[PDB]
Amino acid sequence: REVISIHIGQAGIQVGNACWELYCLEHGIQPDGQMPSDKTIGGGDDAFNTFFSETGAGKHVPRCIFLDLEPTVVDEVRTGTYRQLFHPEQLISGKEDAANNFARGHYTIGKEIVDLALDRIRKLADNCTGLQGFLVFNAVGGGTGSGLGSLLLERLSVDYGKKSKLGFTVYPSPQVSTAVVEPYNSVLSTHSLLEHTDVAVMLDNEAIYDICRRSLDIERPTYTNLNRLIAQVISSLTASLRFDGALNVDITEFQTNLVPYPRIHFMLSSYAPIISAEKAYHEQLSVAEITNAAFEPASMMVKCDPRHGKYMACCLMYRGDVVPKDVNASVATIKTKRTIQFVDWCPTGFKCGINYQPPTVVPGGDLAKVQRAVCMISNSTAIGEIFSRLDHKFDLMYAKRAFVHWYVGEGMEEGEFSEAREDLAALEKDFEEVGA
Amino acid sequence: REVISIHIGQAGIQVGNACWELYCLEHGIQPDGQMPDAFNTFFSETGAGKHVPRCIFLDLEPTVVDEVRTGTYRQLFHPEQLISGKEDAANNFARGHYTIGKEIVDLALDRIRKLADNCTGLQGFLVFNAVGGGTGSGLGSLLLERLSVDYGKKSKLGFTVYPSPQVSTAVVEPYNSVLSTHSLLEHTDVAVMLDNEAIYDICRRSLDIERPTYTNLNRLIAQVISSLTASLRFDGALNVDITEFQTNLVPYPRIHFMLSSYAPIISAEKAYHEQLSVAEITNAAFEPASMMVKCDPRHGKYMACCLMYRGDVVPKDVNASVATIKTKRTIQFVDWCPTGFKCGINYQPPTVVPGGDLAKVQRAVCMISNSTAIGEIFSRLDHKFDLMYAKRAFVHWYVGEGMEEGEFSEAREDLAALEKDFEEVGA
Amino acid sequence: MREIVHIQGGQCGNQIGAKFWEVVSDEHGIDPTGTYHGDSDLQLERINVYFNEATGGRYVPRAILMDLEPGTMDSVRSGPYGQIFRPDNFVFGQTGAGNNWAKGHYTEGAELIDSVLDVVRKEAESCDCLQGFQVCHSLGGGTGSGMGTLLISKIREEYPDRMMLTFSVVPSPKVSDTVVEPYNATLSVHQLVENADECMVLDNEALYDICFRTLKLTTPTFGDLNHLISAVMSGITCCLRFPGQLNADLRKLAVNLIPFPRLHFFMVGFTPLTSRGSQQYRALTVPELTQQMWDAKNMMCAADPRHGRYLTASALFRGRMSTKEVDEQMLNVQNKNSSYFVEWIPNNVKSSVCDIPPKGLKMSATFIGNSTAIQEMFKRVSEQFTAMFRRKAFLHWYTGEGMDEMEFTEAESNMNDLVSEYQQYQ
Amino acid sequence: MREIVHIQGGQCGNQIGAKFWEVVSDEHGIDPTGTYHGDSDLQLERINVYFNEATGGRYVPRAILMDLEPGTMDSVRSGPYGQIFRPDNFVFGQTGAGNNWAKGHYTEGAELIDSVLDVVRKEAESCDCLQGFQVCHSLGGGTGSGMGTLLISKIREEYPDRMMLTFSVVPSPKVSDTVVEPYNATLSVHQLVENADECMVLDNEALYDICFRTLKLTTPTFGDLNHLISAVMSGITCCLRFPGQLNADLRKLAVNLIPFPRLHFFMVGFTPLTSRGSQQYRALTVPELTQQMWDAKNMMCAADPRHGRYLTASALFRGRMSTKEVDEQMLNVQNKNSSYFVEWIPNNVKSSVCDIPPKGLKMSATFIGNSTAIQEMFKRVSEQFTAMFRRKAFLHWYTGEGMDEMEFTEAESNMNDLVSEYQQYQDASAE
Amino acid sequence: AATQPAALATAENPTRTQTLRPLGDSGLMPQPGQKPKGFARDELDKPHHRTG
Amino acid sequence: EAYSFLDGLVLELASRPGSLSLLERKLVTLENNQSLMSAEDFKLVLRQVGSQLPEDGIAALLTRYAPAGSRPGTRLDAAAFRNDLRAASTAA
Numbered sequence A: 001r002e003v004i005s006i007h008i009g010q011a012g013i014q015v016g017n018a019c020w021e022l023y024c025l026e027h028g029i030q031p032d033g034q035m036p037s038d039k040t041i042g043g044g045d046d047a048f049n050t051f052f053s054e055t056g057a058g059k060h061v062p063r064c065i066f067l068d069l070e071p072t073v074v075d076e077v078r079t080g081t082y083r084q085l086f087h088p089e090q091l092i093s094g095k096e097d098a099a100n101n102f103a104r105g106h107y108t109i110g111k112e113i114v115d116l117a118l119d120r121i122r123k124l125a126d127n128c129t130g131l132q133g134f135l136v137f138n139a140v141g142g143g144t145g146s147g148l149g150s151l152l153l154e155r156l157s158v159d160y161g162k163k164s165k166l167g168f169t170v171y172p173s174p175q176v177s178t179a180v181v182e183p184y185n186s187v188l189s190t191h192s193l194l195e196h197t198d199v200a201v202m203l204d205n206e207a208i209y210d211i212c213r214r215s216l217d218i219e220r221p222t223y224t225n226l227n228r229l230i231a232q233v234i235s236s237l238t239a240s241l242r243f244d245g246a247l248n249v250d251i252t253e254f255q256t257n258l259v260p261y262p263r264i265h266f267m268l269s270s271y272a273p274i275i276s277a278e279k280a281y282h283e284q285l286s287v288a289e290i291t292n293a294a295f296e297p298a299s300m301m302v303k304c305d306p307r308h309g310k311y312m313a314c315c316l317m318y319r320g321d322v323v324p325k326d327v328n329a330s331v332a333t334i335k336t337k338r339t340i341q342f343v344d345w346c347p348t349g350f351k352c353g354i355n356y357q358p359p360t361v362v363p364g365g366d367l368a369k370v371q372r373a374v375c376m377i378s379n380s381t382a383i384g385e386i387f388s389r390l391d392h393k394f395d396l397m398y399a400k401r402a403f404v405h406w407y408v409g410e411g412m413e414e415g416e417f418s419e420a421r422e423d424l425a426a427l428e429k430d431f432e433e434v435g436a
Numbered sequence B: 001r002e003v004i005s006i007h008i009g010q011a012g013i014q015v016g017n018a019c020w021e022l023y024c025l026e027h028g029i030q031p032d033g034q035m036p037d038a039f040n041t042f043f044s045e046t047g048a049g050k051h052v053p054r055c056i057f058l059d060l061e062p063t064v065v066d067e068v069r070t071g072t073y074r075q076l077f078h079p080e081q082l083i084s085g086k087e088d089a090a091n092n093f094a095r096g097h098y099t100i101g102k103e104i105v106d107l108a109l110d111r112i113r114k115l116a117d118n119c120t121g122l123q124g125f126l127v128f129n130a131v132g133g134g135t136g137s138g139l140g141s142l143l144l145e146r147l148s149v150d151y152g153k154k155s156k157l158g159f160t161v162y163p164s165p166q167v168s169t170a171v172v173e174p175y176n177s178v179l180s181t182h183s184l185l186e187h188t189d190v191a192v193m194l195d196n197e198a199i200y201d202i203c204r205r206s207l208d209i210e211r212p213t214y215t216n217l218n219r220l221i222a223q224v225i226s227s228l229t230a231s232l233r234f235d236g237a238l239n240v241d242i243t244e245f246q247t248n249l250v251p252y253p254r255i256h257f258m259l260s261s262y263a264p265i266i267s268a269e270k271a272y273h274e275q276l277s278v279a280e281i282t283n284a285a286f287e288p289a290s291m292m293v294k295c296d297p298r299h300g301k302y303m304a305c306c307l308m309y310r311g312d313v314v315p316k317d318v319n320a321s322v323a324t325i326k327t328k329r330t331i332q333f334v335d336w337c338p339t340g341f342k343c344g345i346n347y348q349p350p351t352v353v354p355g356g357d358l359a360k361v362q363r364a365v366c367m368i369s370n371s372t373a374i375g376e377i378f379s380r381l382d383h384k385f386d387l388m389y390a391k392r393a394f395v396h397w398y399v400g401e402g403m404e405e406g407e408f409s410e411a412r413e414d415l416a417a418l419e420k421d422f423e424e425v426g427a
Numbered sequence C: 001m002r003e004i005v006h007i008q009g010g011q012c013g014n015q016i017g018a019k020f021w022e023v024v025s026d027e028h029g030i031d032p033t034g035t036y037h038g039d040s041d042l043q044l045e046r047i048n049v050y051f052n053e054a055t056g057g058r059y060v061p062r063a064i065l066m067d068l069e070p071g072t073m074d075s076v077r078s079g080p081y082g083q084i085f086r087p088d089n090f091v092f093g094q095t096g097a098g099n100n101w102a103k104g105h106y107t108e109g110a111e112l113i114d115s116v117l118d119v120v121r122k123e124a125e126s127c128d129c130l131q132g133f134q135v136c137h138s139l140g141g142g143t144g145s146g147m148g149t150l151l152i153s154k155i156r157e158e159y160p161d162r163m164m165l166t167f168s169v170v171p172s173p174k175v176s177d178t179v180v181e182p183y184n185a186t187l188s189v190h191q192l193v194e195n196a197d198e199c200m201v202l203d204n205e206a207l208y209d210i211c212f213r214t215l216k217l218t219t220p221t222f223g224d225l226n227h228l229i230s231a232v233m234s235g236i237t238c239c240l241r242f243p244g245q246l247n248a249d250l251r252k253l254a255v256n257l258i259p260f261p262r263l264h265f266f267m268v269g270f271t272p273l274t275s276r277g278s279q280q281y282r283a284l285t286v287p288e289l290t291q292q293m294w295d296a297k298n299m300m301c302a303a304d305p306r307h308g309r310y311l312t313a314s315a316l317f318r319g320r321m322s323t324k325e326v327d328e329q330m331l332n333v334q335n336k337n338s339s340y341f342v343e344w345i346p347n348n349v350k351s352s353v354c355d356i357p358p359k360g361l362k363m364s365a366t367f368i369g370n371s372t373a374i375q376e377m378f379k380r381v382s383e384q385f386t387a388m389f390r391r392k393a394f395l396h397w398y399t400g401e402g403m404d405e406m407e408f409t410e411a412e413s414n415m416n417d418l419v420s421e422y423q424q425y426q
Numbered sequence D: 001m002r003e004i005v006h007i008q009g010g011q012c013g014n015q016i017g018a019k020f021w022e023v024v025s026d027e028h029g030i031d032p033t034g035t036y037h038g039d040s041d042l043q044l045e046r047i048n049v050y051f052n053e054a055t056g057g058r059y060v061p062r063a064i065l066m067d068l069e070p071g072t073m074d075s076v077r078s079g080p081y082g083q084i085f086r087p088d089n090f091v092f093g094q095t096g097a098g099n100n101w102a103k104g105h106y107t108e109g110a111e112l113i114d115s116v117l118d119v120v121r122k123e124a125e126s127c128d129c130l131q132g133f134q135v136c137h138s139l140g141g142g143t144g145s146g147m148g149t150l151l152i153s154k155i156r157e158e159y160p161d162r163m164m165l166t167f168s169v170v171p172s173p174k175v176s177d178t179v180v181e182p183y184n185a186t187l188s189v190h191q192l193v194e195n196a197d198e199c200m201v202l203d204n205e206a207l208y209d210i211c212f213r214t215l216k217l218t219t220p221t222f223g224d225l226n227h228l229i230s231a232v233m234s235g236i237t238c239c240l241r242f243p244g245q246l247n248a249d250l251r252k253l254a255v256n257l258i259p260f261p262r263l264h265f266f267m268v269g270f271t272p273l274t275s276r277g278s279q280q281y282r283a284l285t286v287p288e289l290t291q292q293m294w295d296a297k298n299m300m301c302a303a304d305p306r307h308g309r310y311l312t313a314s315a316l317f318r319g320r321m322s323t324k325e326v327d328e329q330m331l332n333v334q335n336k337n338s339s340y341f342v343e344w345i346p347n348n349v350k351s352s353v354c355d356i357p358p359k360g361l362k363m364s365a366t367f368i369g370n371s372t373a374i375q376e377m378f379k380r381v382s383e384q385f386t387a388m389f390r391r392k393a394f395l396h397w398y399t400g401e402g403m404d405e406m407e408f409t410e411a412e413s414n415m416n417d418l419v420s421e422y423q424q425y426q427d428a429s430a431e
Numbered sequence E: 001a002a003t004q005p006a007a008l009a010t011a012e013n014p015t016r017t018q019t020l021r022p023l024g025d026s027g028l029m030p031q032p033g034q035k036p037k038g039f040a041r042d043e044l045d046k047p048h049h050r051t052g
Numbered sequence F: 001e002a003y004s005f006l007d008g009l010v011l012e013l014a015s016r017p018g019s020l021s022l023l024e025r026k027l028v029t030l031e032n033n034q035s036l037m038s039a040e041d042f043k044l045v046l047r048q049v050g051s052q053l054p055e056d057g058i059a060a061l062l063t064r065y066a067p068a069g070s071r072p073g074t075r076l077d078a079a080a081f082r083n084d085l086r087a088a089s090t091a092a
């Protein structure tokens, strides 16, 4: 069993830098490449194989490619501490940026590098034997992540087919944002993320900022803490594949028990307990309260209120000192609360996953070392209001044809703007009808 | 079984500071938070080797909460439980009821649920606040309303502080008290009356402390709370739980106001000479000069009585004492309540706080009765409320916040109806 | 053979049953660990009535303990002879009734009586010939009065032919604990007058008077009162457990004390009862037992029989004795004060003899008198009920649970007709 | 001579089989090495029913392991008695059904069913007289439910006369793990009601209830539930392996418990189960065995017997016992509680006696009672199934694999008239 | 200043007031009516009751 | 001579083994914003942890680890004292 991850854009490979540091610290791989100790604890031998491939020996190269158009961050990765770990051929870097332009990175610049990305990922999959599926990281506000990501996912779909492609994207927050023309990129990314991504996990940046200011009490949080939280989420997500548990769940479990229809795949992420080191000592750690904290909107990774929507299906990943009895009791407790409701579509809208190894802690990080944790992935109808909220401010811009001359010059036209608007409206209608 | 306490305003959290100090002293918990199972109703066995109270401090002025955060019990309190606002209501019911509260109350009642789910045998809530202030009166009423709508059937006891008849520390406290009691009527289950001059007199005449501060007042209020929770906490011969108060002390749903008393309130030097027995400590718990409220039930008629006994007490002695009390005609009961007593016996003696002014005793009494002099209290407050309302003083403060005069008149007539009900029931 | 199954309700019932089981275990010679260590063979033949052979001479009491608060069970398990009760017999609720008849009779009884019925049906069907049921509880508390009454009615519906005893304590105005005692007492009595087979009324003030005047104790804790009640209860079923010159089972006592089925409220006394200081200076003869048994100040009820008529009477005797002296004393007490006995029933006293006295004693006696003075306390409770119910005090706690005014009205209606017939037969 | 072959499906099936083989290998006194170390000479004479003699007093279980994820192979060889199975019997694919009935019944089961069919045909013909097939599996997963029932069917058209046991656990809403449990469960029941000879219904909810109330354990993991299931599975087949006063083969119980061919759903109980705290208050008598055997709280199914009627019942007793006491206890329990037993079948209770008790015990019992209250759980599953299927939730994962909408409707209709048959037979009059 | 010396004093000689039981004028022991410590409470706080 | 007092303290804390790790936790948790501890708080912690040390020894320890610029007996450097206590604990 193996999974290969591709990181698109400037933020994508920063998230990858956090994730791979966490993986190397968790699997005990020295950043030069080799494992000092051959003995293993917990998951057992051959555990590292799903992330690291046994190349020659004394090295374990990750099954990832960093692809980006601006060379500065890729060269910073090349020059930093992890020179020997990453292969020189996997850090794909372009020569000029896409410049927040979906058209530029989708028609002009992406065409010369997507072929190299594909013919490297082809041999990455060839080296594999039990590929569960792909999973991607990108931000739809940029040019490379939004523009090139669409083409890369389309070509991956046409080259492989029904293979799982988990989408961990980063949407612009409704109030706090960094760019100006990003509604165009986001909408033109949605028009293909609808039909190409198998499971899409939403991640707003302001929600994690609120989590850090509120829970971990770093009054000046930067992108590194956000990336570390994303890495913790992904690790708690793949711990079932990596290590042994009571009820292990693989990748093709999520699509079966969280996707009621092929065009409805949008997951709110949640994590518990996100607590500081000092708060960790006065607060008890048991399944009940960490499960309760996993459904509160104040600890969600996306700025939306699930109380305005109806839960369709939920997924619960457990780590550490967790046994079936107390998680069963906790999930029974949740169903009694009438504050949160489940759609009548699915009475048993729960799926639990239990692992035994507690999440690891990184020196310099802010999360505390805890006995247990919960990673929650659910499907509800707040995605409908999120999309319409972005749609309104996208339609504000297009009425005056602002910034449209940039896109048309690269080689696209204005028809796909209209069809993306119509696709978003149809998605809103679909979500509303499903909510009934 | 567990009980969680909520404290509102500058008075509530100081009373909590005394109460939790007493609780930690009783169960042998170090101020750090760990011992060197009877404590389960107050403390939670969090993580490894730590006890955290089931309490929240919420206030709008940050100074007192912050000073609590740096006091002796820094690591005793779970840090997110101590809620602290950004700016106070400044003795304005409307300001703390319409403008500031809507932001802090939601987080407060979200976090109380983080305590309720931990609880498995939650007996009920109990609130500490003073209606004289702004955030205790205004925001407190909203918090109690949302507790009532959110939970409903669970008990919500109350130990409020109305302004004392002549001695007071503010000017606009009649408005705050009236607009607070209008909601205190139909939201709290049992309300325990507490004034300041009564406690000052108790500390002056009995404990002969010439210059008492709020510390002694809070200490003995904590003593009363501990004596009324000891039945749930420790083991006794014949105990009473929280529900017993609402079963045997409120004959009607709209009459829940309790006069409190405590005995023996004695110092160290007088403890040696007095032969403290059940009879006289029961007698002292009935004199008007040893009550926590500046009112005389001799003007009214007793409707019920609750007696709490701690330590070296036997049922025969309390039965003899209650018989002697019942035979006395200086105090008179209402005709329709022939058996208006309810005795509670516990074996754990009251603990002494080092540096405090109370002494070691073998037995103690905490009396909580229902009478009709509380209608006199409300009428005396209403007199001076209507005195200054005629010329509409300070009203421009309230109207600007968002309220109107409809609330003033409706609270006034609600208080008048309360007086009518109290005088009718006492017939 | 004939089997007695024990049922305990409330804190009072639990303490009374604990003392009763300690006394019985002492009589039959089993240690607090549960193993037989007695001397005579008479202590083996008739111990099935109370215990069950487990293994290696281990006997488990035939008891079911009922309550709604963990304190009573914890105190029962903590005390001596607390390691002989089977844990499955500790049927147990969680929330507590708390001095409210309605909670223990309509709401809390609903989800708890199913387990109590399950355990009592499981144990009762285990034995071959159930002599009857035995219940000790209280009419002041909530889980003892309401839940116990519901269980009584359920057993009467389930096993109708079997006997049933009810050792129920009734609170008194002089020694009064709870404010709402009349509300529970009147309705519990209203249910008992049709449900229970025969009732023997206990009262705490009478026990206090007995322990003050007779035993001359200065601090009569609940231990002494429970000891007196346990001795009385053990004395009742002594003939079933040991041979005698004239045996008498529970039905034999009931048939000789109930001429009309609605008159089953007995007033009880025990003898001998002497202080430790005056223990040396008394001779131990049949007249010394008879003169104290008939004394009004020895009765464990709050009713003076001199204000009424001994409609029927009974006497249980323990020890190697002369039947001639027993009969002569009974005839003497019958013929001396002829005004205290009813006219249309001659020979109102039923006598029985057992040759095995309680441990540490050579002679003992027990009295069960169905007098028409038992209606004094019924009026004493109904007057408070009418005085408080006329103003609907504390009624909103009863009405807002399922009960309405009709239950109350029927309660004093049955109270009045019972007391009226008791007065009529005087 | 009378031979039972064992088939294990899915993770739950493999763990249940591991516990069952541990307890059976302990019963016949063979060490985890695989050689004989027992004391009594009565064990060696009847070990051919479960073990084949390999070499030098070494016996290998007559078991087949079948599932789709290597973690279960790691788990099987992790505990003791993990090196006694023959490696050739580990028929195994590696894709994983993934909680999908269609994957384990049409896509992945189609090609891997032939290898396991080869294995079971090779192992079944290696012995003389097959008593029947025994399968333990689940109705919630994909590799245990779909593949398991397809193998059930295949054996059924291959061997039509042999007996067939199915120890299957059915998911419950009280303890629900996955989302699509009714979708798999309804179709698995649809296939079982037509293929399996008789089904011995288990449930994790009742097992947790037993381990919490009766045993009063602190952390009842899956090990305790699998131990209870293994104890039942050992108790049911005791008569073949040991002599007794009244023997009872599987076919005898099947004919004495099944009045009509479609009524082959039973509920399970075991006796005795006492907490170590209550251990020194216990007695060792037949009455306390029948007192806990008939208790509604001891049933390993989430269906209350007092909500229906007892069509037939059976009890398997082990240990040195008197037939008179067993007969009189059965007669008394039949006559006293006379309203819970069906009227047109007199003498509803069948009994058997064995002389060899399980290791560490002096006496024991096992209950297999065909009741009409077992349709309570079928309705409880069908209501969720029709709640989901009314508006086609998660249907694309099944119809996008080869299945059609007709199969779901036929499964609903068959489950519905099965519960209707149970109801009609419950309310039937003797005249 | 009110709390610090109190904490120092209670830390200097930490003695917890044990529950004293009044002795009756008899050989019998008081045997308190209730107790908040025992296995019944421990059974009550078991978390498995929440699932049903 | 506070070094001998520290050796006596660590030798005393060698017994009752739970008392050694508790004192470092008390120092860290009760620490100020900086690595400062009051003398009253230090004596309170020493009494709470179960160590009975003469007041002159406490004064000597305070003087040895007093932060620069303060009254010689008003405060104590928590971090330095804890770090030097770690070496003494690991030495025995």
Ligand SMILES: Nc1nc2c(ncn2[C@@H]2O[C@H](COP(=O)(O)OP(=O)(O)OP(=O)(O)O)[C@@H](O)[C@H]2O)c(=O)[nH]1
Pocket (backbone or CB within 6 Å): B008, B009, B010, B011, B012, B014, B015, B060, B061, B088, B089, B090, B091, B092, B130, B131, B132, B133, B134, B135, B136, B137, B161, B168, B169, B170, B196, B214, B217, B218
């Ligand atoms: N018994 C007692 N009363 C107190 C205490 N502290 C304050 N009070 C009373 O509370 C009244 C005013 O309410 P406060 O709590 O002080 O003020 P507040 O509730 O914070 O309202 P704002 O000042 O407007 O924010 C005063 O008149 C005091 O008599 C205390 O510690 N003990």
Ligand SMILES: Nc1nc2c(ncn2[C@@H]2O[C@H](COP(=O)(O)OP(=O)(O)O)[C@@H](O)[C@H]2O)c(=O)[nH]1
Pocket (backbone or CB within 6 Å): C009, C010, C011, C012, C015, C016, C067, C098, C099, C138, C140, C141, C142, C143, C144, C145, C169, C171, C176, C177, C178, C204, C222, C225, C226, E033
């Ligand atoms: N004789 C006797 N009376 C008792 C005992 N314990 C309590 N009582 C009486 O029972 C009354 C209260 O009963 P209560 O505890 O409320 O019963 P419950 O609520 O049903 O469990 C009090 O008036 C006591 O006098 C006992 O051990 N012996």
Ligand SMILES: Nc1nc2c(ncn2[C@@H]2O[C@H](COP(=O)(O)OP(=O)(O)O)[C@@H](O)[C@H]2O)c(=O)[nH]1
Pocket (backbone or CB within 6 Å): D009, D010, D011, D012, D015, D016, D067, D098, D099, D138, D140, D141, D142, D143, D144, D145, D169, D171, D175, D176, D177, D178, D204, D222, D225, D226
């Ligand atoms: N009794 C018992 N139940 C189990 C065991 N393992 C899993 N289960 C139950 O089986 C259900 C899911 O089965 P699953 O693991 O998907 O089986 P598979 O995928 O077909 O191999 C869950 O609800 C579990 O409660 C076990 O060892 N014993």
Ligand SMILES: [Mg+2]
Pocket (backbone or CB within 6 Å): A009, A010, A011, A142, A143, A144, A145
């Ligand atoms: Mg970019």
Ligand SMILES: [Mg+2]
Pocket (backbone or CB within 6 Å): B010, B061, B088, B090, B133, B134, B135
């Ligand atoms: Mg203030």
